[model samples]
Target: KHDYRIALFGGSQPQSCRYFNPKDYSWTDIRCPFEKRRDAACVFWDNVVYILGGSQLFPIKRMDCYNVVKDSWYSKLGPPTPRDSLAACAAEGKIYTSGGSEVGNSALYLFECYDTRTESWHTKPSMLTQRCSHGMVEANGLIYVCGGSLGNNVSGRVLNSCEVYDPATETWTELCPMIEARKNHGLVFVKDKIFAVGGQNGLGGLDNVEYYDIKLNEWKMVSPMPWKGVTVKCAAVGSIVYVLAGFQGVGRLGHILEYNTETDKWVANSKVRAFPVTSCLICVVDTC
Candidate 1:
């Protein structure tokens, strides 16, 4: 439900990040004052986005918060537990993070929360579904994940797989899942809805699609992908989300799939291109 898409993807330059508004397809360079660092962690609260973390620099970590309303910045100290490029989100006036690879190179599901009240950290229920290669998205303030890679062949059953993370509850819950136990598929948020689009089912690629229903609390079928069947990547451009047919490995020259949220349709773009590495989807970001 966000009007602006704050996509911070790239690194080839000093001011590597820029602002994008898909409504008019324009760009604005809001150069950050901090030193350029990769794998940094960030989260948003109210109108400010709190950023902190780094990689390959003795693991340097510092918090820099930007005020959207005031066009200003604030500095804050980060957590006692050091982590970078981790899953960080804000809920109920606190900052929470899940998972990390640190110190001992151990896979951690540790939930460390930073309460703005005391500006300190604490632990939470760290248990998760115990799966990987699953697609997740933040919708309506909760994290939604559907299907999974289940660790083999990229998938088997679990298509009816659905789960949600409620930050306030600080817990994960399973819901009625998707029609396709989608693997290597496209998941995108369009018009307040979640689309678990084209993916793999059985031994082949998939075109049959389904979307998660928010109010009804179930999965409903959507129009099948108008083109070929293969594992596809869903790229977000604010209000308009685009889907390319396949990855470079399983790729073919195909149509650029577009979504119209208002009419609830998947339309094909006139731009038919080949998929080699990034398929020039990075081209969209590069041009701006």
Candidate 2:
């Protein structure tokens, strides 16, 4: 039996967190301490979930943590620089955040790392390029980032560039660019490849999907999304990659898409049975 639990955090709505159990196919609400936030980054480590920087009307430096076992939320020291639309990943017991925007959606090249054991943050080597609304994932000890706007929302430019960070060496290496420039997309690591899911170019939402192979150092097109939307987020469990809610041009969506990496196909799953929210963060937590 599949007993995995999925958690969604921080959207335009105030301090809302929801959990989905695949076995029951139901969503249950969890309370958070922070207010309504959009474009926030989130990660789970050692049974605790950390909500990083985000914005409502302006960028915020709020860092909140929720303990799944105890069902409680607590505040931690915020990052040095306030930002939204940032990307973060947990590796080697440390959480790393990179490339987001400040007030007015201005893009940044800042990089920082947090040690949960000490509950302290420290600066790290900056990214090679400034970006926001991008997707990032850790694979084989390297963090790979791709496709986002180059500047703030008013004058921001969509980017096709990609890069990777090596913590072992504390440096960045430019990688092959994506075929399409996308923002507010979802990135997940499955098997040995990194999948970049639906997001928007300058025009609007996209259905295109692609995967990057580290062994080959190249990107390859995969099956496109069934629905066209942006602000998408994803998490991988077993061999299935689950894509959560997003904006579908006219309004927000509550549907979920399950993509089978082995089959390389997508299928519509259950729609969330609550208020539809977009720009949410998702992660897999083991319940067994």
Candidate 3:
């Protein structure tokens, strides 16, 4: 009844998607259709996993879904706004995506939603900010986005602003900004708190981490990461938050960092047997 799976998707090389057992620490790989893609978005819903917009050289609209039960892949309707480096999460029986750039390095304020029931895409209200490489999460039926760039690649301007979307009203309201402005960071909703992990600014890659308390409506800095990273991906299993592989300066990393909410500290550092060749998109799935 406590079974869980960690799936890592997308890299800059022709590498298969990696899947791991969180309970046993065992791992395996599944063949993916694309090659050498990074800055993609992925989410898990029902019994299937969805891999959405990403890029190798230019942004791609390709959408692929994996059936965990059957261990198979199939195509799905791609997003209207084809982009990579966007933020995606599942909520209210639908998938929501926000903020990414196109081939020309133009940032977008685009927001859209996909209904799993109808398999259709619907354009939603745009975010207040145009950004890419941001972090997003769904908590209490609201989608919160934080810290991404305004332009593209190394020339982009990093942002510290954060915002929340209320589906019931279909409106976005700005929230308190983070302690540091960053792009290509990771966000995870652990218990009632949301944690923002490592990312980069114009200065360089960041080791700083922080969290937001919904009840308090405030942000507080946490311990810095053991290493600096960008385009990091995160997933939470219970109260433990996992920071997966990402880019660090001139090299790609396969190191995984674990943070325990109960202890309010990062507990361990582990490495994947085969490191992804580029930035990775990660998600968690639970099966009974």
lDDT by residue for model 1 over 1-288, one digit each (tens)? 344544342333453544544555444555556655444555666666666554556665567666665766788776555654344556677776655445553334555677877877788776364333345566767876565443234333434577778876767887887877775566666666788877665556676677888777888887776765655645566455666435533545265676665666777766443232221112122121
Superposed by TM-score, candidate 2 places the C-alpha of residue 218 at a distance from the truth, in angstroms, of: 0.7
User: Compared with the true structure, what per-residue lDDT tens digits does model 3 show for residues 1-288?
Assistant: 557877887642445577766666666776776564666788888888888887666667678888887878888767888887788999988999998888776678999999999989999999999888888899999999998888644666899999999999999999999989988787989888899988888778888889988888889998877767665666788888777677877776556777887787874455444246456668888654
Q: What TM-score against the true fold does each predicted structure earn?
A: 0.61, 0.91, 0.92
User: Which residue pairs does candidate 3 place in steric collision?
Assistant: 12-36
Stretches of candidate 2 off by over 4 Å are 1-3, 11-15, 152-155, 270-275
Candidate maximizing TM-score: 3
Query: What total of clashing residue pairs does each candidate reach?
Result: 1, 0, 1
lDDT of 2 by residue, 1-288 (tens): 335788987542443568877666677777765676777888877777888888777667678888888888888877888788888888888889988877654788899999988988999999998998888888888988898888655666888888999999998999988878888888889889998888898888889889888889898999987788766767787777777677888886557787899999898765543236675678776544
TM for candidate 2 is: 0.91
Which regions of candidate 3 are displaced past 4 Å?
Answer: 11-15, 152-155, 270-274
Model 1 RMSD in angstroms: 6.4
